[PDB]
């Protein structure tokens, strides 16, 4: 039967199939190749993906996301304590493990992380089933290289709930290396720099005659594109207050509209130097109309961009590597499209040019689908 490839990310998932010798990254029911990893429990309905994410503004306690931060961890882990103080939905201690508590028709309902991740996996399964016109029972699913056995098993258990046998767990750096087709012959050391919406991971991957080994990994669990958007949000909220005596934070719908336009503006500024951020009646009778330049975008985020080098230094130090010891730099995650990110990486490595894909958001799912193809022969 078919084996599909799923990137189960922190902020999103992505599903690919291997069919007639080509990988096809599949569109969800809204036409998007990336699906936000959100699940909403509002008014007796359960939504998964973009429709769930839209519930977060008005139903923040009922809109579950970032469950990958909890999966296979313990409630008292330092990282989980920090995530409970950041996340707006209730997290409870179930026999030492974090569980998610929501209401369904007013009833308290408690889910293991893998039950929420299963709902994401079921949606990816259904996309694949509709496209292949046949049932899917098997998948390759990606994990972070730093995932321990409990985190990998909880991910497999998410698959089993979704009716997917996870025939192989591959780490995200290996998935990237397969996607970019890095030559498997002889020995190659690769720096995989993965800057997503919520998280930053960097790994040293060694490929030795077809055998992939991650020699070192480091990152920042709370550094991604969402943080760069928030820096912009913060600035324009201060400016709108200075000019108009309106604090946009007092209206959650206004903040939601601004965040959508700021995200688009950031993406524009990876290509152009100046963009307009425009919302008619951001509150009643008050338009939002601003210009953001690439220079000001960079100025607002310079410290966060340069923070990404701290984990790069750590993996080189952990592996006892010279910068020169790295043979190729590979970028994954949509945030690696920011020109300043590529410049800083290039300059840290004493001029060396990074390799970057053209669809860096899909590279991991693409490699998972390649691994599916490899397993079927
Ligand atoms: N929840 C959720 C969710 C929604 C979209 C994405 C994809 O992006 C991961 C990160 O990558 C960032 N990013 C992206 N990602 C591309 C992208 C954005 C939205 C969708 Cl639906 C898809 Cl097909 C792809 N492009 C960027 C660009 N041109 N310049 C700077 N940052 C860019 C994006 O802003 C985000 O922070 C990830 C998760």
mmCIF file of C-alpha atoms and ligand atoms in Angstrom:
data_model
loop_
_atom_site.group_PDB
_atom_site.id
_atom_site.type_symbol
_atom_site.label_atom_id
_atom_site.label_comp_id
_atom_site.label_asym_id
_atom_site.label_seq_id
_atom_site.Cartn_x
_atom_site.Cartn_y
_atom_site.Cartn_z
ATOM 1 C CA UNK A 1 0.000 0.000 0.000
ATOM 2 C CA UNK A 2 1.052 3.676 -0.082
ATOM 3 C CA UNK A 3 3.595 5.231 2.307
ATOM 4 C CA UNK A 4 3.247 9.038 2.624
ATOM 5 C CA UNK A 5 5.711 11.531 4.117
ATOM 6 C CA UNK A 6 4.589 14.009 6.851
ATOM 7 C CA UNK A 7 6.558 16.906 8.362
ATOM 8 C CA UNK A 8 4.874 17.298 11.808
ATOM 9 C CA UNK A 9 6.306 20.753 12.611
ATOM 10 C CA UNK A 10 5.837 22.917 15.740
ATOM 11 C CA UNK A 11 3.664 25.538 13.971
ATOM 12 C CA UNK A 12 2.584 23.552 10.843
ATOM 13 C CA UNK A 13 2.464 20.221 9.077
ATOM 14 C CA UNK A 14 3.099 19.365 5.435
ATOM 15 C CA UNK A 15 2.290 16.134 3.560
ATOM 16 C CA UNK A 16 3.966 14.673 0.438
ATOM 17 C CA UNK A 17 3.381 11.512 -1.638
ATOM 18 C CA UNK A 18 5.904 9.721 -3.942
ATOM 19 C CA UNK A 19 3.998 8.843 -7.133
ATOM 20 C CA UNK A 20 5.281 8.023 -10.673
ATOM 21 C CA UNK A 21 8.870 8.855 -9.529
ATOM 22 C CA UNK A 22 8.053 12.391 -8.277
ATOM 23 C CA UNK A 23 7.276 13.908 -4.887
ATOM 24 C CA UNK A 24 4.006 15.869 -4.774
ATOM 25 C CA UNK A 25 3.532 18.171 -1.789
ATOM 26 C CA UNK A 26 -0.274 18.266 -1.448
ATOM 27 C CA UNK A 27 -2.666 21.237 -0.974
ATOM 28 C CA UNK A 28 -5.144 21.170 1.928
ATOM 29 C CA UNK A 29 -8.857 21.829 1.273
ATOM 30 C CA UNK A 30 -8.018 25.674 1.294
ATOM 31 C CA UNK A 31 -5.272 25.333 -1.413
ATOM 32 C CA UNK A 32 -2.221 25.652 0.923
ATOM 33 C CA UNK A 33 0.782 23.287 1.026
ATOM 34 C CA UNK A 34 1.395 24.164 4.719
ATOM 35 C CA UNK A 35 -1.401 23.535 7.335
ATOM 36 C CA UNK A 36 -1.179 25.321 10.714
ATOM 37 C CA UNK A 37 -0.956 22.752 13.558
ATOM 38 C CA UNK A 38 -4.031 24.180 15.341
ATOM 39 C CA UNK A 39 -7.089 22.367 16.711
ATOM 40 C CA UNK A 40 -10.112 24.366 18.074
ATOM 41 C CA UNK A 41 -12.858 23.143 20.427
ATOM 42 C CA UNK A 42 -15.501 25.946 20.187
ATOM 43 C CA UNK A 43 -19.361 25.628 20.469
ATOM 44 C CA UNK A 44 -19.497 21.812 19.985
ATOM 45 C CA UNK A 45 -17.370 21.828 16.746
ATOM 46 C CA UNK A 46 -13.759 20.663 16.288
ATOM 47 C CA UNK A 47 -11.675 22.383 13.564
ATOM 48 C CA UNK A 48 -8.117 21.502 12.418
ATOM 49 C CA UNK A 49 -5.786 23.855 10.532
ATOM 50 C CA UNK A 50 -6.351 27.405 9.352
ATOM 51 C CA UNK A 51 -10.015 27.414 10.461
ATOM 52 C CA UNK A 52 -8.907 26.452 14.028
ATOM 53 C CA UNK A 53 -6.152 29.126 14.025
ATOM 54 C CA UNK A 54 -8.775 31.806 13.184
ATOM 55 C CA UNK A 55 -10.603 30.796 16.439
ATOM 56 C CA UNK A 56 -7.548 31.799 18.596
ATOM 57 C CA UNK A 57 -8.412 35.530 18.663
ATOM 58 C CA UNK A 58 -11.878 35.183 20.237
ATOM 59 C CA UNK A 59 -11.416 31.689 21.845
ATOM 60 C CA UNK A 60 -7.760 31.579 23.045
ATOM 61 C CA UNK A 61 -8.424 28.976 25.825
ATOM 62 C CA UNK A 62 -10.155 26.574 23.300
ATOM 63 C CA UNK A 63 -7.595 26.865 20.482
ATOM 64 C CA UNK A 64 -4.787 24.322 20.902
ATOM 65 C CA UNK A 65 -1.422 24.686 19.169
ATOM 66 C CA UNK A 66 2.324 24.101 19.631
ATOM 67 C CA UNK A 67 1.551 20.663 21.156
ATOM 68 C CA UNK A 68 4.930 19.406 19.763
ATOM 69 C CA UNK A 69 6.484 21.478 22.614
ATOM 70 C CA UNK A 70 4.763 19.119 25.133
ATOM 71 C CA UNK A 71 4.723 15.724 23.394
ATOM 72 C CA UNK A 72 6.638 13.002 25.328
ATOM 73 C CA UNK A 73 7.780 15.487 28.060
ATOM 74 C CA UNK A 74 7.106 15.652 31.822
ATOM 75 C CA UNK A 75 4.918 18.356 33.433
ATOM 76 C CA UNK A 76 7.816 19.556 35.710
ATOM 77 C CA UNK A 77 10.454 19.743 32.890
ATOM 78 C CA UNK A 78 11.931 23.316 32.846
ATOM 79 C CA UNK A 79 10.870 23.659 29.162
ATOM 80 C CA UNK A 80 7.224 22.590 29.885
ATOM 81 C CA UNK A 81 6.976 24.966 32.905
ATOM 82 C CA UNK A 82 8.026 27.826 30.531
ATOM 83 C CA UNK A 83 5.525 26.722 27.802
ATOM 84 C CA UNK A 84 2.646 26.521 30.378
ATOM 85 C CA UNK A 85 3.365 30.211 31.303
ATOM 86 C CA UNK A 86 3.302 31.153 27.542
ATOM 87 C CA UNK A 87 0.360 29.041 26.203
ATOM 88 C CA UNK A 88 -3.233 30.245 26.776
ATOM 89 C CA UNK A 89 -5.020 26.851 26.876
ATOM 90 C CA UNK A 90 -4.975 24.914 30.148
ATOM 91 C CA UNK A 91 -2.161 22.344 30.673
ATOM 92 C CA UNK A 92 -2.700 19.844 33.542
ATOM 93 C CA UNK A 93 -0.487 17.317 35.302
ATOM 94 C CA UNK A 94 -1.716 13.803 34.465
ATOM 95 C CA UNK A 95 0.511 11.327 36.390
ATOM 96 C CA UNK A 96 3.576 13.573 35.791
ATOM 97 C CA UNK A 97 2.843 14.302 32.082
ATOM 98 C CA UNK A 98 1.376 17.440 30.485
ATOM 99 C CA UNK A 99 -2.159 17.069 29.139
ATOM 100 C CA UNK A 100 -4.395 19.666 27.447
ATOM 101 C CA UNK A 101 -7.720 20.639 29.034
ATOM 102 C CA UNK A 102 -10.513 22.256 26.937
ATOM 103 C CA UNK A 103 -14.320 22.337 26.996
ATOM 104 C CA UNK A 104 -16.533 20.527 24.485
ATOM 105 C CA UNK A 105 -20.198 21.701 24.879
ATOM 106 C CA UNK A 106 -19.064 23.092 28.323
ATOM 107 C CA UNK A 107 -17.666 19.667 29.431
ATOM 108 C CA UNK A 108 -14.066 19.504 30.669
ATOM 109 C CA UNK A 109 -12.135 17.248 28.270
ATOM 110 C CA UNK A 110 -8.456 16.263 28.744
ATOM 111 C CA UNK A 111 -6.177 15.153 25.826
ATOM 112 C CA UNK A 112 -2.662 13.768 25.718
ATOM 113 C CA UNK A 113 -0.441 15.737 23.292
ATOM 114 C CA UNK A 114 -0.420 12.701 20.971
ATOM 115 C CA UNK A 115 -4.261 12.811 20.773
ATOM 116 C CA UNK A 116 -4.042 16.437 19.437
ATOM 117 C CA UNK A 117 -1.115 15.560 17.098
ATOM 118 C CA UNK A 118 -3.211 12.566 15.880
ATOM 119 C CA UNK A 119 -5.929 15.037 14.752
ATOM 120 C CA UNK A 120 -3.272 16.899 12.683
ATOM 121 C CA UNK A 121 -1.992 13.568 11.271
ATOM 122 C CA UNK A 122 -5.588 12.456 10.431
ATOM 123 C CA UNK A 123 -6.059 15.675 8.376
ATOM 124 C CA UNK A 124 -2.765 15.027 6.500
ATOM 125 C CA UNK A 125 -3.852 11.354 5.939
ATOM 126 C CA UNK A 126 -7.203 12.520 4.475
ATOM 127 C CA UNK A 127 -5.432 14.979 2.070
ATOM 128 C CA UNK A 128 -3.263 12.056 0.840
ATOM 129 C CA UNK A 129 -6.229 9.599 0.602
ATOM 130 C CA UNK A 130 -8.301 12.064 -1.515
ATOM 131 C CA UNK A 131 -5.288 12.713 -3.831
ATOM 132 C CA UNK A 132 -4.211 9.018 -4.203
ATOM 133 C CA UNK A 133 -7.910 7.873 -4.351
ATOM 134 C CA UNK A 134 -7.054 5.021 -1.930
ATOM 135 C CA UNK A 135 -6.683 4.370 1.817
ATOM 136 C CA UNK A 136 -3.347 5.261 3.541
ATOM 137 C CA UNK A 137 -2.194 3.183 6.561
ATOM 138 C CA UNK A 138 1.576 3.942 6.554
ATOM 139 C CA UNK A 139 3.768 7.042 6.841
ATOM 140 C CA UNK A 140 7.261 8.360 7.329
ATOM 141 C CA UNK A 141 7.084 11.131 9.939
ATOM 142 C CA UNK A 142 9.803 13.609 10.850
ATOM 143 C CA UNK A 143 11.072 14.541 14.311
ATOM 144 C CA UNK A 144 13.715 16.990 15.547
ATOM 145 C CA UNK A 145 17.200 15.409 15.861
ATOM 146 C CA UNK A 146 17.111 16.293 19.623
ATOM 147 C CA UNK A 147 13.886 14.199 20.229
ATOM 148 C CA UNK A 148 14.476 11.446 22.860
ATOM 149 C CA UNK A 149 12.873 7.959 22.739
ATOM 150 C CA UNK A 150 9.797 9.114 24.750
ATOM 151 C CA UNK A 151 9.195 12.008 22.279
ATOM 152 C CA UNK A 152 9.655 9.645 19.281
ATOM 153 C CA UNK A 153 7.355 6.996 20.824
ATOM 154 C CA UNK A 154 4.638 9.628 21.626
ATOM 155 C CA UNK A 155 4.867 10.713 17.936
ATOM 156 C CA UNK A 156 4.476 7.056 16.803
ATOM 157 C CA UNK A 157 1.486 6.814 19.210
ATOM 158 C CA UNK A 158 -0.032 9.934 17.522
ATOM 159 C CA UNK A 159 0.297 7.977 14.226
ATOM 160 C CA UNK A 160 -1.421 4.845 15.670
ATOM 161 C CA UNK A 161 -4.389 6.996 16.939
ATOM 162 C CA UNK A 162 -4.672 8.572 13.434
ATOM 163 C CA UNK A 163 -4.673 5.047 11.894
ATOM 164 C CA UNK A 164 -1.087 5.522 10.519
ATOM 165 C CA UNK A 165 1.602 2.933 11.148
ATOM 166 C CA UNK A 166 4.755 5.139 11.290
ATOM 167 C CA UNK A 167 7.053 2.714 9.424
ATOM 168 C CA UNK A 168 10.068 5.086 9.957
ATOM 169 C CA UNK A 169 10.827 8.160 12.084
ATOM 170 C CA UNK A 170 13.547 10.251 10.387
ATOM 171 C CA UNK A 171 15.145 13.308 11.906
ATOM 172 C CA UNK A 172 14.504 16.729 10.279
ATOM 173 C CA UNK A 173 18.202 17.234 9.191
ATOM 174 C CA UNK A 174 18.237 13.848 7.341
ATOM 175 C CA UNK A 175 14.853 14.743 5.683
ATOM 176 C CA UNK A 176 16.383 18.078 4.485
ATOM 177 C CA UNK A 177 19.539 16.225 3.179
ATOM 178 C CA UNK A 178 17.324 13.795 1.204
ATOM 179 C CA UNK A 179 15.232 16.687 -0.226
ATOM 180 C CA UNK A 180 18.311 18.629 -1.437
ATOM 181 C CA UNK A 181 19.625 15.314 -2.739
ATOM 182 C CA UNK A 182 23.040 15.722 -0.995
ATOM 183 C CA UNK A 183 25.466 13.163 -2.613
ATOM 184 C CA UNK A 184 25.468 10.031 -0.376
ATOM 185 C CA UNK A 185 28.861 8.811 -1.764
ATOM 186 C CA UNK A 186 32.086 9.522 0.239
ATOM 187 C CA UNK A 187 31.958 11.760 3.397
ATOM 188 C CA UNK A 188 30.107 15.215 3.515
ATOM 189 C CA UNK A 189 29.580 17.465 6.709
ATOM 190 C CA UNK A 190 26.421 19.632 6.378
ATOM 191 C CA UNK A 191 25.188 22.489 8.604
ATOM 192 C CA UNK A 192 21.367 22.296 8.549
ATOM 193 C CA UNK A 193 20.060 25.741 9.697
ATOM 194 C CA UNK A 194 16.306 25.470 10.227
ATOM 195 C CA UNK A 195 14.525 28.734 11.128
ATOM 196 C CA UNK A 196 10.753 28.255 11.184
ATOM 197 C CA UNK A 197 7.750 30.191 12.488
ATOM 198 C CA UNK A 198 8.294 29.405 16.162
ATOM 199 C CA UNK A 199 11.597 27.514 16.586
ATOM 200 C CA UNK A 200 15.246 27.610 15.490
ATOM 201 C CA UNK A 201 17.294 24.409 15.180
ATOM 202 C CA UNK A 202 20.813 23.874 13.841
ATOM 203 C CA UNK A 203 22.510 20.495 13.361
ATOM 204 C CA UNK A 204 25.813 19.162 11.982
ATOM 205 C CA UNK A 205 24.824 16.251 9.734
ATOM 206 C CA UNK A 206 27.577 13.884 8.478
ATOM 207 C CA UNK A 207 26.766 11.752 5.376
ATOM 208 C CA UNK A 208 29.223 8.852 5.003
ATOM 209 C CA UNK A 209 28.623 6.436 2.083
ATOM 210 C CA UNK A 210 24.794 6.591 2.480
ATOM 211 C CA UNK A 211 24.778 6.625 6.306
ATOM 212 C CA UNK A 212 23.430 9.803 7.929
ATOM 213 C CA UNK A 213 24.471 10.804 11.474
ATOM 214 C CA UNK A 214 23.699 14.041 13.325
ATOM 215 C CA UNK A 215 26.989 14.800 15.221
ATOM 216 C CA UNK A 216 25.585 17.774 17.157
ATOM 217 C CA UNK A 217 22.411 19.818 17.597
ATOM 218 C CA UNK A 218 21.505 23.141 19.262
ATOM 219 C CA UNK A 219 18.821 25.755 18.879
ATOM 220 C CA UNK A 220 16.430 28.234 20.421
ATOM 221 C CA UNK A 221 12.956 26.897 21.171
ATOM 222 C CA UNK A 222 11.360 30.429 21.170
ATOM 223 C CA UNK A 223 12.958 32.164 18.124
ATOM 224 C CA UNK A 224 11.219 32.165 14.730
ATOM 225 C CA UNK A 225 9.362 34.214 12.108
ATOM 226 C CA UNK A 226 6.460 34.860 14.586
ATOM 227 C CA UNK A 227 8.984 36.743 16.836
ATOM 228 C CA UNK A 228 10.089 38.984 13.889
ATOM 229 C CA UNK A 229 6.382 39.771 13.220
ATOM 230 C CA UNK A 230 5.867 40.592 16.924
ATOM 231 C CA UNK A 231 8.831 43.089 16.826
ATOM 232 C CA UNK A 232 7.074 44.861 13.906
ATOM 233 C CA UNK A 233 3.665 44.690 15.712
ATOM 234 C CA UNK A 234 5.250 46.275 18.815
ATOM 235 C CA UNK A 235 6.689 49.178 16.814
ATOM 236 C CA UNK A 236 3.512 50.031 14.840
ATOM 237 C CA UNK A 237 1.319 49.702 17.990
ATOM 238 C CA UNK A 238 3.588 52.315 19.692
ATOM 239 C CA UNK A 239 3.437 54.546 16.557
ATOM 240 C CA UNK A 240 -0.383 54.301 16.180
ATOM 241 C CA UNK A 241 -0.748 55.274 19.876
ATOM 242 C CA UNK A 242 1.620 58.277 19.466
ATOM 243 C CA UNK A 243 -0.240 59.537 16.367
ATOM 244 C CA UNK A 244 -3.889 58.631 17.059
ATOM 245 C CA UNK A 245 -4.242 58.152 20.892
ATOM 246 C CA UNK A 246 -5.467 54.597 20.158
ATOM 247 C CA UNK A 247 -3.763 51.597 21.783
ATOM 248 C CA UNK A 248 -4.549 48.800 19.291
ATOM 249 C CA UNK A 249 -3.899 46.182 22.034
ATOM 250 C CA UNK A 250 -7.306 47.235 23.531
ATOM 251 C CA UNK A 251 -9.078 45.548 20.555
ATOM 252 C CA UNK A 252 -8.143 41.879 19.893
ATOM 253 C CA UNK A 253 -9.798 41.970 16.405
ATOM 254 C CA UNK A 254 -7.598 45.009 15.496
ATOM 255 C CA UNK A 255 -4.448 43.096 16.603
ATOM 256 C CA UNK A 256 -5.558 40.049 14.501
ATOM 257 C CA UNK A 257 -6.046 42.242 11.367
ATOM 258 C CA UNK A 258 -2.662 43.991 11.929
ATOM 259 C CA UNK A 259 -0.755 40.668 12.460
ATOM 260 C CA UNK A 260 -2.109 39.276 9.133
ATOM 261 C CA UNK A 261 -0.874 42.415 7.241
ATOM 262 C CA UNK A 262 2.476 42.534 9.120
ATOM 263 C CA UNK A 263 3.170 38.866 8.169
ATOM 264 C CA UNK A 264 2.505 39.723 4.451
ATOM 265 C CA UNK A 265 4.677 42.878 4.728
ATOM 266 C CA UNK A 266 7.572 40.867 6.175
ATOM 267 C CA UNK A 267 7.354 38.387 3.279
ATOM 268 C CA UNK A 268 7.282 41.285 0.718
ATOM 269 C CA UNK A 269 10.428 42.742 2.293
ATOM 270 C CA UNK A 270 12.392 39.526 1.402
ATOM 271 C CA UNK A 271 11.975 40.737 -2.233
ATOM 272 C CA UNK A 272 11.274 44.541 -2.186
ATOM 273 C CA UNK A 273 12.759 47.407 -0.072
ATOM 274 C CA UNK A 274 9.465 49.161 0.929
ATOM 275 C CA UNK A 275 5.876 47.897 1.435
ATOM 276 C CA UNK A 276 2.527 49.337 2.568
ATOM 277 C CA UNK A 277 0.662 47.936 5.556
ATOM 278 C CA UNK A 278 -3.008 48.922 5.125
ATOM 279 C CA UNK A 279 -6.180 48.068 7.132
ATOM 280 C CA UNK A 280 -9.402 50.031 6.508
ATOM 281 C CA UNK A 281 -11.238 50.740 9.806
ATOM 282 C CA UNK A 282 -8.679 48.801 11.927
ATOM 283 C CA UNK A 283 -11.075 50.182 14.536
ATOM 284 C CA UNK A 284 -14.305 51.971 13.484
ATOM 285 C CA UNK A 285 -13.469 55.312 11.806
ATOM 286 C CA UNK A 286 -9.638 54.851 11.913
ATOM 287 C CA UNK A 287 -7.587 53.446 9.023
ATOM 288 C CA UNK A 288 -4.144 51.943 9.480
ATOM 289 C CA UNK A 289 -1.740 53.052 6.739
ATOM 290 C CA UNK A 290 2.029 52.713 7.181
ATOM 291 C CA UNK A 291 5.170 52.054 5.166
ATOM 292 C CA UNK A 292 7.739 49.537 6.432
ATOM 293 C CA UNK A 293 11.209 49.448 4.894
ATOM 294 C CA UNK A 294 13.582 46.491 4.786
ATOM 295 C CA UNK A 295 16.086 48.645 6.778
ATOM 296 C CA UNK A 296 13.590 49.236 9.617
ATOM 297 C CA UNK A 297 12.422 45.542 9.525
ATOM 298 C CA UNK A 298 16.143 44.561 9.951
ATOM 299 C CA UNK A 299 16.764 47.219 12.627
ATOM 300 C CA UNK A 300 13.746 45.946 14.660
ATOM 301 C CA UNK A 301 15.029 42.319 14.552
ATOM 302 C CA UNK A 302 18.865 42.608 14.290
ATOM 303 C CA UNK A 303 19.471 41.174 17.783
ATOM 304 C CA UNK A 304 17.152 38.149 17.115
ATOM 305 C CA UNK A 305 18.827 37.489 13.746
ATOM 306 C CA UNK A 306 22.315 37.540 15.411
ATOM 307 C CA UNK A 307 20.987 35.291 18.268
ATOM 308 C CA UNK A 308 20.719 32.458 15.642
ATOM 309 C CA UNK A 309 24.590 32.394 15.535
ATOM 310 C CA UNK A 310 24.825 31.345 19.252
ATOM 311 C CA UNK A 311 23.555 27.784 18.514
ATOM 312 C CA UNK A 312 25.756 27.650 15.348
ATOM 313 C CA UNK A 313 28.833 28.351 17.548
ATOM 314 C CA UNK A 314 27.584 25.710 20.073
ATOM 315 C CA UNK A 315 27.258 22.851 17.499
ATOM 316 C CA UNK A 316 30.721 23.650 15.982
ATOM 317 C CA UNK A 317 32.132 23.660 19.599
ATOM 318 C CA UNK A 318 30.227 20.392 20.545
ATOM 319 C CA UNK A 319 31.513 18.592 17.364
ATOM 320 C CA UNK A 320 35.020 20.120 17.808
ATOM 321 C CA UNK A 321 34.620 21.481 14.233
ATOM 322 C CA UNK A 322 36.418 24.418 12.565
ATOM 323 C CA UNK A 323 34.020 26.557 10.488
ATOM 324 C CA UNK A 324 36.086 25.295 7.463
ATOM 325 C CA UNK A 325 35.183 21.653 8.432
ATOM 326 C CA UNK A 326 31.585 22.415 7.197
ATOM 327 C CA UNK A 327 31.308 21.394 3.454
ATOM 328 C CA UNK A 328 27.777 22.796 2.693
ATOM 329 C CA UNK A 329 25.131 24.986 4.476
ATOM 330 C CA UNK A 330 21.533 24.067 3.888
ATOM 331 C CA UNK A 331 18.595 26.380 4.912
ATOM 332 C CA UNK A 332 15.163 25.071 5.865
ATOM 333 C CA UNK A 333 12.147 27.090 7.024
ATOM 334 C CA UNK A 334 10.432 30.019 5.346
ATOM 335 C CA UNK A 335 12.288 32.483 7.614
ATOM 336 C CA UNK A 336 15.612 31.665 5.819
ATOM 337 C CA UNK A 337 14.205 33.753 2.881
ATOM 338 C CA UNK A 338 15.081 36.925 4.887
ATOM 339 C CA UNK A 339 18.114 38.353 3.044
ATOM 340 C CA UNK A 340 19.728 39.519 6.317
ATOM 341 C CA UNK A 341 19.616 35.910 7.681
ATOM 342 C CA UNK A 342 21.521 34.616 4.635
ATOM 343 C CA UNK A 343 24.054 37.483 4.885
ATOM 344 C CA UNK A 344 24.778 36.850 8.585
ATOM 345 C CA UNK A 345 25.197 33.051 7.970
ATOM 346 C CA UNK A 346 27.511 33.677 4.924
ATOM 347 C CA UNK A 347 29.654 36.199 6.944
ATOM 348 C CA UNK A 348 29.917 33.961 10.097
ATOM 349 C CA UNK A 349 31.473 31.287 7.839
ATOM 350 C CA UNK A 350 34.173 33.762 6.701
ATOM 351 C CA UNK A 351 32.497 34.392 3.329
ATOM 352 C CA UNK A 352 31.223 30.902 2.465
ATOM 353 C CA UNK A 353 27.893 30.918 0.500
ATOM 354 C CA UNK A 354 24.925 29.009 2.124
ATOM 355 C CA UNK A 355 22.833 26.663 -0.068
ATOM 356 C CA UNK A 356 19.160 27.533 0.218
ATOM 357 C CA UNK A 357 16.236 25.783 -1.497
ATOM 358 C CA UNK A 358 13.460 27.662 -3.332
ATOM 359 C CA UNK A 359 10.592 26.159 -1.153
ATOM 360 C CA UNK A 360 12.373 25.964 2.238
ATOM 361 C CA UNK A 361 9.031 25.458 4.125
ATOM 362 C CA UNK A 362 8.389 22.121 2.266
ATOM 363 C CA UNK A 363 11.989 20.674 2.192
ATOM 364 C CA UNK A 364 11.401 18.437 5.258
ATOM 365 C CA UNK A 365 8.087 16.932 4.017
ATOM 366 C CA UNK A 366 9.761 16.494 0.609
ATOM 367 C CA UNK A 367 12.590 14.490 2.216
ATOM 368 C CA UNK A 368 10.057 12.430 4.247
ATOM 369 C CA UNK A 369 8.292 11.524 0.966
ATOM 370 C CA UNK A 370 11.704 10.601 -0.589
ATOM 371 C CA UNK A 371 12.354 8.327 2.466
ATOM 372 C CA UNK A 372 8.882 6.753 1.844
ATOM 373 C CA UNK A 373 9.973 6.103 -1.790
ATOM 374 C CA UNK A 374 13.309 4.595 -0.613
ATOM 375 C CA UNK A 375 11.492 2.199 1.770
ATOM 376 C CA UNK A 376 9.073 0.926 -0.962
ATOM 377 C CA UNK A 377 11.872 0.452 -3.596
HETATM 378 N N1 LIG B 1 0.703 28.443 12.179
HETATM 379 C C1 LIG B 1 1.125 28.622 11.095
HETATM 380 C C2 LIG B 1 1.847 28.702 9.849
HETATM 381 C C3 LIG B 1 1.532 29.510 8.719
HETATM 382 C C4 LIG B 1 2.570 29.676 7.706
HETATM 383 C C5 LIG B 1 3.836 29.002 7.891
HETATM 384 C C6 LIG B 1 5.009 29.014 6.930
HETATM 385 O O1 LIG B 1 6.158 29.787 7.351
HETATM 386 C C7 LIG B 1 7.134 29.489 8.403
HETATM 387 C C8 LIG B 1 7.774 30.900 8.653
HETATM 388 O O2 LIG B 1 8.450 31.339 7.466
HETATM 389 C C9 LIG B 1 8.186 32.706 7.328
HETATM 390 N N2 LIG B 1 8.304 33.057 5.930
HETATM 391 C C10 LIG B 1 7.716 32.435 4.769
HETATM 392 N N3 LIG B 1 6.947 31.180 4.720
HETATM 393 C C11 LIG B 1 6.171 30.973 3.494
HETATM 394 C C12 LIG B 1 4.713 30.713 3.623
HETATM 395 C C13 LIG B 1 3.829 31.570 4.365
HETATM 396 C C14 LIG B 1 2.444 31.112 4.445
HETATM 397 C C15 LIG B 1 2.042 29.851 3.755
HETATM 398 CL CL1 LIG B 1 0.429 29.191 3.789
HETATM 399 C C16 LIG B 1 2.957 29.105 3.000
HETATM 400 CL CL2 LIG B 1 2.413 27.736 1.959
HETATM 401 C C17 LIG B 1 4.278 29.518 2.949
HETATM 402 N N4 LIG B 1 8.037 33.131 3.660
HETATM 403 C C18 LIG B 1 8.798 34.182 4.075
HETATM 404 C C19 LIG B 1 9.389 35.239 3.374
HETATM 405 N N5 LIG B 1 9.223 35.356 2.006
HETATM 406 N N6 LIG B 1 10.134 36.120 4.067
HETATM 407 C C20 LIG B 1 10.244 35.951 5.390
HETATM 408 N N7 LIG B 1 9.687 35.021 6.179
HETATM 409 C C21 LIG B 1 9.008 34.160 5.490
HETATM 410 C C22 LIG B 1 6.695 32.873 7.713
HETATM 411 O O3 LIG B 1 6.377 34.208 7.972
HETATM 412 C C23 LIG B 1 6.679 32.006 8.980
HETATM 413 O O4 LIG B 1 7.133 32.764 10.121
HETATM 414 C C24 LIG B 1 4.044 28.211 9.010
HETATM 415 C C25 LIG B 1 3.074 28.046 9.957
#
